[PDB]
Homo-oligomer: 444 residues x 4
């Protein structure tokens, strides 16, 4: 069934470095539309990954395809780093405006979420005149040297490549699942905030910290959301010490959580700096750092620019992509379908006790599998068999951190397919319970 | 004059929203559409392109094979990240790049989006393969704007100011200047002198045996189209291999036929890099890059040490396959060599008549025409180069400057001889015009 | 009483940088002996600080004075960095032998605890081929760029001097007083070991960590001892991952804790690397890093040396200093006088509820002062009052961390004097409770 | 032969316990006692000290006033830390040092234990005062063995190997070499060439406006007794003062009369430092050091940014007070100046008869005699230098080498003319004896 796919992968493994791919299964995609992937052997699948939340508006949206094709006929590329073009001008202004909050904003383009997160460091340091950056354990911010240092989701992002960027301090992110007996959401918030302050009470001067960077919901961490009160404490801590408050919206923005921006899951928080990428241009490489105007004015050329950033085709694909999110009401749909999928997985959890935790905000969720509900011991083996059963039954899903099923379908996903995919996962759970699935390095 | 009104207005609006640090400004050129070496602005004016979007447009604007590849690919799959799964344009391209890279040792590839991220990877791969931390790169260099690649760079102080500390364990060395030499020095003197400067850190505080790699532009772009002497490069290459130091090259600006060979390092005798970076022209300006390295080196890391969600995007992969096909079947490597020897002669003739031209440097349709206040002092004359680019722009030619006083000559490799001759004549005219004070002219350039 | 002191201090202030002294009171010491200090105004005091535990054998001990005098007549200095002298030869050998545990050891001399801690970093990195160093929040390791990066007890050891040494990670030290309601010592041990592991489970590879450096009892932190269990877990974690286990015995060695080395308060822990200073030469500038032999052979000259380290006068003084420790049995005497002083402090806590915590291990202690025994809000104002009283009644004592009284008198302090000092401290509490004490920057 | 038995046994026992990286080895000299310029070993052999414990014994070994200050202070108080409290000998010295420092601008002082830690303080104070991060130091320099000062250094690869990453944001520049020059170069050509190298990092990746200080040895010690030319120093001093860069000097080795002025920076016209490190001879080899800077620089930090338990030890402080009085009362500064000019002639005369002497450098009783295999190639001759110090040791003279091939001449400043001439005759004989192959030889030296 995967004869061609397997032959092409075996060839690719001779020429394409293994560090450039987290492998799960032999899926070679030929074409796709909406939430449907078709492989080179003719197998069809429903996509519950959306190329890691880059395909929020669905694969090959008619509108995005046309913008791409039309723009490519006029100009494939002229660098905004030297000169200008219209899609770029129009996009940079539109992004300045749809970013959360009311303060005047400016924008700088990149190619990837990585480089936008490097930008956040640059802009925070330059505006504050301070050097230290605080970021979170469990985070993923990119694979360039700045954003990679801020990250804490894989040891292979640190092994053999150091020394890393200096003056970076990692603090732990609130885990509302593996908690101490009898802890409320209040306790968790306060205990993690207390851990947050320890470096500041010892070796890290708050008056020399340029900024704090946070995923309002951690993606690669395992779809973990900060509690409301935790986040308001951090936010407040930052404004009281003149530390910029920065958000990474690259994974969780553009409607993934059922609001436009995942920071809007929290009350009245306007970031000083934010990174955007992934779904921005429907998987075409474009990113943006968007900060308050006075922060963005603290650097002079050429501190931060890329030859191919704000590519006019990418830009056109992005304008059409933002229009699909508005015109098809994808933010609201994500909230709705997400509430629905939440209820469906909680019901499955009544019948499959390998499901320890159901986290979901919009059509973005982490379904954490454990060996026993009270030890909460991770059971990656179970998760791997679930995704293997899924793949063999027309559903593409992967894991985070070994034992968490990752749920991030295109937001356009028809209800019919959503229900088919959910039924396969229910079936998978039963199969794995029954010993009916068996199995190099898989996943994180 | 009264011909740039729409452009001026759109720019004044853009500047309210788009950070000033994101653009090196020259003139009010807003491109509407383009083809070949011809740009058409939003005001309907037409220009001959002598920049090729900073060497990203080697096959010319909107090549119909590249357009075609983009549109057809987009119809099937806009994206699926090769960081998790696979697609055919990316598989075919990675393989092809491993084979067409310089030399015969087997290679592997890792994709990025930018020349910046590929140079970050060179750091990664070198350190992991060698187990050593120090990186040596050059004064005058440009490697990118991510923290690794930006630290390696040495072409603008605005790439260091207010954003440090930068990446540790990097050392800069001077790049050979063959124009501003000491009186009497030969090419051999220059080579030896700059090799002696290369060795000074290694003879004091920098252990050769803890140095992972030396990264070098075979010809420096942002530095001002400066080529290392043959013998210099041989000594550095030799030194690297006597010490277990990887020899790495940046072919982002000067690869893919720009110098009149496929790769800039092929201007030198029998140098095979361990690691190289590619970008820019790779996919005709679509965002795609690669680090190409020897197979053992590229095997030194495990995932996810280096990957990006949108790197090796299939639309960009398809555009790149089409771009590399065009380069071969249109013979762009050879055309760049032939037209370049021709451009060099035309500029040397111009230098006989216009004493402000201190140095003509050209390898392929890749040149730096360095302007100076006096042939003997060689004092840079930025003001004159700024004047020449303003004159050129006003007569339908788009050209910019490097390091203040150097005219950057990098037109698409497809440039028709008709247009190349029109553009060279306009520059000839510009020199005369500037001599006679006809041209007038906040921060322009580097 | 302090006419001459103040005129002298006033002049010094014009010429000696204020960063170079943590200020408490106008004490200008003219001479001393044992535990008795006499100022230039002829006032007399009892020494409860021992020059930050640098004078364990008491001031101007007759045998150390003689060593100094006699050596200075033969050779004031010849640098062992180029050549050799006998007092240095003899001391290095003796130090290699009296270090804890029985693995063969070698030694390098420095001038300060600070530089011995820089050496720990060098030797750990060199022996392991790894770069990362873990140290603790609340730690104090020194004032040279390496040791100072590792430290975690004053924001003024980081402010304005960065960037600091890279590849250093700080972890939380187990606080056995401000705990969560219900916690045993077992819970504390495991909670703080769980914090220890978090960086190694996110961004810090255990296999690239060269060493963990720990004060067995933290001094500048407030005389905080690590629980036995937490320490066995860290100790084990390092052996399992090839991380070197290193201890700082600069403040807490040489009998301060009632055993020879503070690490001997724990069961069967032989360190890979250790720093020594302070009391080693009676406050004469001398330090050593002592490591397992194979660790110390990982470097070639001149990786770690100083012109004036292992100065022969300093080495003579140290040899004599060590002999007094043995022949006056100060190790035993510290343990006895400390169990005694502990009960005297527990007694005072009965009558003075402002005493929230009594921590004592040998004649080494911290007496923590609070505003309430349940809130445990620190009362810095109280502790400043207590020490200002003590001073005005012939007792030299200082505060750690604002609110913690520091009890570290020379180990040879006579029982008569100890009781004299303790009674002044008793009077001090009552006087402060009755508002009978009134009082820029003081202490930490 | 048969004279070194006790020494050999002792060193052989020492090597089992004392780490090999703590000593640069030359020969089996184990000192029992010394006085003035006379060392006596444990075997009862006698020698003339031409090293002064690396310029730490300027006033001679066991000077009676220094020995007396040590004894007398020890009976009153061996230590009370100035980091917490005060004592009279530290107070007096802190003030004398602020006053005897070069230039008229008011100064403050902070005490350390070692020249290393004083250079670490230079880094901190410079960063703190300017609010800038970058430090510029020299290739060939030695500043110390603590992470800050060690990162500044550039005289041995074993100061960087296996212990990095080092301190970030440090840049090394080359120190002017007036011996191995290009044909025809005057001292003006050297000064300008080395300044042009100084400027290259500031013209590429290092913003002058983000550079906190330059740290320079006025005469390099471990680099081989190399003195910057006057004009090179003026250009650096100038450049610093035009950009808000602190100008900092290390006087640890070359201070306190060694050069035949009180401070080596006084060999230059009208240069006052912002910061200087002092150590070594300060307290006659007892562990004491100071950072001395302009008042306002020293006020840029709050406690405890820079302090040490045993810094400003009262015993070391009294030794230092006595040491400085001896320097003044015995006219040691002028004596180094006079005996220096005399020693220079002598060596210059030896050069005529022994052509292996390639270069004679001398400023005070402070010289490097550089041995080469040929006058025109200037190829280092380590072998010859090592043979000379072995001849020398055998005939009652203790001298060592710098950089392989450079004889280090740094006797106590109080050395009597008869001993000086005794030791100079031995060296004259050494040369001739090595020319005849009469001398035989782990790693020796640097
Ligand atoms: C290829 C997918 C990546 C391994 C990872 N996402 C990348 C990411 C990034 C980096 O984005 P790129 O540089 O575009 O990959 C930045 N911020 C967050 C919150 C991210 O999740 C993920 O979603 O698994
Ligand atoms: C926008 C253009 C850029 C400022 C500059 N070239 C970028 C470049 C880069 C960086 O490539 P990107 O990250 O794709 O901009 C890497 N290596 C070399 C040799 C380069 O020249 C240039 O050609 O001027
Ligand atoms: C001046 C005294 C110091 C501020 C401080 N102790 C210095 C110290 C040091 C540094 O020793 P020095 O470099 O000799 O000051 C190293 N390790 C520990 C555990 C230390 O406590 C103290 O005990 O308060
Ligand atoms: C032990 C002798 C040392 C290897 C070396 N000098 C130490 C030194 C130092 C360091 O002094 P300490 O840290 O006291 O050794 C600082 N600055 C200069 C210019 C120095 O020369 C020397 O003079 O050979």
């Amino acid at each position: 069934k995967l004869d061609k796919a397997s032959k092409l992968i075996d060839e690719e493994n001779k020429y394409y470095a293994r560090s450039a791919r987290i492998n799960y299964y032999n899926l070679v995609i030929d074409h796709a539309h909406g939430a449907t992937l078709v492989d080179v052997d003719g197998n069809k699948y429903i996509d519950l990954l959306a190329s890691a939340s880059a395909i929020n508006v669905g694969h090959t949206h008619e509108k995005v395809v046309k913008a791409i094709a039309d723009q490519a006929q006029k100009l494939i590329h002229y660098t905004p780093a030297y000169f200008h073009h219209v899609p770029g001008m129009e996009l940079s202004e539109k992004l300045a405006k749809i970013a959360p909050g009311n303060s005047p904003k400016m924008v700088s383009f990149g190619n990837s979420g990585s480089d936008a997160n490097d930008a956040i460091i640059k802009f925070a340091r330059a505006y504050t005149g301070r050097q230290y950056i605080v970021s979170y354990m469990g985070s993923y911010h990119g694979s360039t040297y700045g954003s990679q240092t801020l990250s804490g989701s894989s040891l292979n992002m640190t092994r053999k490549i150091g020394p890393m960027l200096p003056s970076v301090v990692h603090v732990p992110y609130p885990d509302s699942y593996r908690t101490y007996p009898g802890e409320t959401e209040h306790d968790v918030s306060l205990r993690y905030f207390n851990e947050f302050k320890k470096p500041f009470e010892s070796f890290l001067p708050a008056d020399e910290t340029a900024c704090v960077l946070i995923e309002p919901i951690q993606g690669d961490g395992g779809i973990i959301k900060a509690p409301e009160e935790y986040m308001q404490l951090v936010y407040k801590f930052c404004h009281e010490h003149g530390i910029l408050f920065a958000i990474d919206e690259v994974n969780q923005g553009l409607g993934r959580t059922g609001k436009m921006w995942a920071i809007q899951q929290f009350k009245d928080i306007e970031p000083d700096l934010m990174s955007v990428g992934k779904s921005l241009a429907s998987g075409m490489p474009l990113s943006a750092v968007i900060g308050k105007k006075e922060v963005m004015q603290s650097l002079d050329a050429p501190a931060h620019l890329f030859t191919t950033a704000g590519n006019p085709v990418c830009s056109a694909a992005s304008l059409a992509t933002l229009d699909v999110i508005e015109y098809e009401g994808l933010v609201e749909k994500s909230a709705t379908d997400g509430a629905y999928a939440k209820q469906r997985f909680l019901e499955m959890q009544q019948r499959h006790p390998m499901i320890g935790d159901v986290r979901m905000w919009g059509l973005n969720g982490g379904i954490e599998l454990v060996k026993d509900p009270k030890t909460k011991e991770p059971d990656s083996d179970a998760a791997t068999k679930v995704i293997y059963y899924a793949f063999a039954h027309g559903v593409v899903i992967i894991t985070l951190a070994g034992n968490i099923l990752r749920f991030q379908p295109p937001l356009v996903i028809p209800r019919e397919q959503l229900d088919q995919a959910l039924q396969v996962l229910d079936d998978a759970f039963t199969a794995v319970e029954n010993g009916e699935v068996t199995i190099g390095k898989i996943g994180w």
